[PDB]
Amino acid sequence: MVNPTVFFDIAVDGEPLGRVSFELFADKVPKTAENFRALSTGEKGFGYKGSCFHRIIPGFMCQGGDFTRHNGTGGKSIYGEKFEDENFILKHTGPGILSMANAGPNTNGSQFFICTAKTEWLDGKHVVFGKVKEGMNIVEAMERFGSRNGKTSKKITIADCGQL
Amino acid sequence: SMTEYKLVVVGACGVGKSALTIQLIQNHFVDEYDPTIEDSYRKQVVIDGETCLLDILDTAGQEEYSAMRDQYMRTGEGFLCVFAINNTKSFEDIHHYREQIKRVKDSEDVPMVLVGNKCDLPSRTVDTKQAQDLARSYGIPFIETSAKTRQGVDDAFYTLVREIRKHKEK
Numbered sequence A: 001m002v003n004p005t006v007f008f009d010i011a012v013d014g015e016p017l018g019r020v021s022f023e024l025f026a027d028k029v030p031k032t033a034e035n036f037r038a039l040s041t042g043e044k045g046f047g048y049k050g051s052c053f054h055r056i057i058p059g060f061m062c063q064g065g066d067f068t069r070h071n072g073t074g075g076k077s078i079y080g081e082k083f084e085d086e087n088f089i090l091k092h093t094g095p096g097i098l099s100m101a102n103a104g105p106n107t108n109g110s111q112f113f114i115c116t117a118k119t120e121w122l123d124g125k126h127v128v129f130g131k132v133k134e135g136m137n138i139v140e141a142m143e144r145f146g147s148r149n150g151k152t153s154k155k156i157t158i159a160d161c162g163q164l
Numbered sequence B: 001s002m003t004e005y006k007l008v009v010v011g012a013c014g015v016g017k018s019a020l021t022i023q024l025i026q027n028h029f030v031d032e033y034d035p036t037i038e039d040s041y042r043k044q045v046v047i048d049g050e051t052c053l054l055d056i057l058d059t060a061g062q063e064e065y066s067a068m069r070d071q072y073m074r075t076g077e078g079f080l081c082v083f084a085i086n087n088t089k090s091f092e093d094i095h096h097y098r099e100q101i102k103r104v105k106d107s108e109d110v111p112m113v114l115v116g117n118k119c120d121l122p123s124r125t126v127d128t129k130q131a132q133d134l135a136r137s138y139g140i141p142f143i144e145t146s147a148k149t150r151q152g153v154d155d156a157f158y159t160l161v162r163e164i165r166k167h168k169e170k
């Protein structure tokens, strides 16, 4: 059972920056991996295409996935607006980790973050479900547009996305 | 020119720190939850017939980062200590917040206002008398507010400015 792979084509104020690909750990977190996979293909009629990375904090992470409100508060999963924390087997071990954003226990939706550093204090609180495969330097390049509180200085969008 | 006052809004997650600040600054309320990292705002206001400039720091209630509050408590001149009237734990967190401010300022006399927010909601769990008594024991004002209806929002921030003024001129 090969873990699935998805891609984002990132744009900065509408101009291409490059492609990031992710391995999704369906072997360990199948429900969370499947949510992200389906949102990347848009096959449920909604998903990540066209949404932005609303919070980028250099030294820590790039966060996105709010495709319902486009303001950092929204998003929804393929299972409903929220779903439970599947497990905390995998840890935030370093740059490239892909993990679920949440507003407390059992509130996963569609928002996610990509680590640009090890963020060990998030272990046990956010569900890790994937990692960057290709294009980590694109994620690093996205940090150029972040700030201390995460507000971005350019519109960082997922211009296209899908499954490889 | 006009005097600038450095205000800092503190309290547990979800009590309404951001909703109160955005009501003050931008005159609106949305019920969406956008948990704060850290935000700064500016607004000029007339208080007691004089114009002054409010510089407001809206802080995160995240318990995980409680050891990173010290730098902003050092720079802040006065503190809005916010709890929600329907959240007993947020009221119990108040003591811990005030104690932290006292330690960083190394003073028992720090400009501060106790704010009981969400007073538009039924099923209150923290009684007004219980909160007035605690503010009485601290020697600071207590104001009940609603970021949703705007009740007490201006009064909370203006009262804190008056407290800072009195402390500076003491």
Ligand SMILES: CCn1c(-c2cc(N3CCN(C)CC3)cnc2[C@H](C)OC)c2c3cc(ccc31)-c1csc(n1)C[C@H](NC(=O)[C@H]1C[C@@H]1C)C(=O)N1CCC[C@H](N1)C(=O)OCC(C)(C)C2
Pocket (backbone or CB within 6 Å): A055, A057, A060, A061, A063, A072, A073, A100, A101, A102, A103, A111, A112, A113, A119, A121, A122, A126, A148, A149, A150, B033, B034, B035, B036, B037, B038, B060, B062, B065, B068
């Ligand atoms: C003290 C200042 N601060 C800091 C902080 C922490 C440090 N440390 C240095 C020493 N090491 C050992 C410990 C940490 C240094 N510098 C800062 C920042 C740069 O100082 C301004 C953070 C933070 C997070 C929140 C609030 C205040 C915060 C917060 C507020 S809502 C939140 N977290 C969780 C967030 N939910 C949402 O969005 C919900 C709405 C959606 C659905 C969420 O799922 N994710 C994903 C994981 C990352 C997290 N967002 C986030 O953005 O983390 C920011 C980060 C910088 C990583 C941590």
Ligand SMILES: Nc1nc2c(ncn2[C@@H]2O[C@H](COP(=O)(O)OP(=O)(O)NP(=O)(O)O)[C@@H](O)[C@H]2O)c(=O)[nH]1
Pocket (backbone or CB within 6 Å): B011, B012, B013, B014, B015, B016, B017, B018, B019, B020, B030, B031, B032, B033, B034, B035, B036, B037, B059, B060, B061, B062, B117, B118, B119, B120, B121, B145, B146, B147, B148, B149
């Ligand atoms: N009914 C009612 N809801 C309120 C009031 N103030 C805030 N809320 C709601 O309570 C939730 C949390 O508000 P918010 O201002 O984000 O709280 P916060 O203290 O800034 N949270 P954090 O520490 O995570 O940044 C939001 O859904 C908001 O609409 C109020 O006076 N009345």
Ligand SMILES: [Mg+2]
Pocket (backbone or CB within 6 Å): B017, B018, B019, B034, B035, B036, B058, B059, B060
């Ligand atoms: Mg807030």
